[PDB]
Amino acid sequence: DILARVDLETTRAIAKQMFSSGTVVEVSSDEEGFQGCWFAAKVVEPVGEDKFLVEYRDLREKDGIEPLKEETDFLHIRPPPPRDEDIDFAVGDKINAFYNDGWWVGVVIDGMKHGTVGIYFRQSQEKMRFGRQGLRLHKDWVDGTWQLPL
């Protein structure tokens, strides 16, 4: 999945450059039930040469009060993507939808009507209308550059 597209040496160096204490980022997970999800977070401090202690913007510890803190590695952290807040989704577009406090990969199945866009999620096999404000085009962070899907 992962490394076929990115370069480890480059990705590590760029993560070291960009993700210092206080830096806003997005983080991902390879735990089940989280595939194609990016969560908003902020770097607390780098950890060793490979990892970053982050504090989540929206996710909480079990009391639902204190922000969740986790270590993440350089392959599961990225900057917030540039967002073109005013664009027209076309059917077939790979998007992210802000759903249950994460950004989830989905596909546009119906163009915008009444300020909503029809979306489908392969993870859950569910489809629904999403307000335009909670949608963005999917982008990949690769070797220090943002790229659209191939």
Binding site: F34, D58, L59, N100
Partner: peptide, 10 residues
């Protein structure tokens, strides 16, 4: 906000 498993799917 929500807990990490309130955000988890399936």
């Amino acid at each position: 906000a929500r807990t990490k498993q309130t955000a988890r799917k399936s």
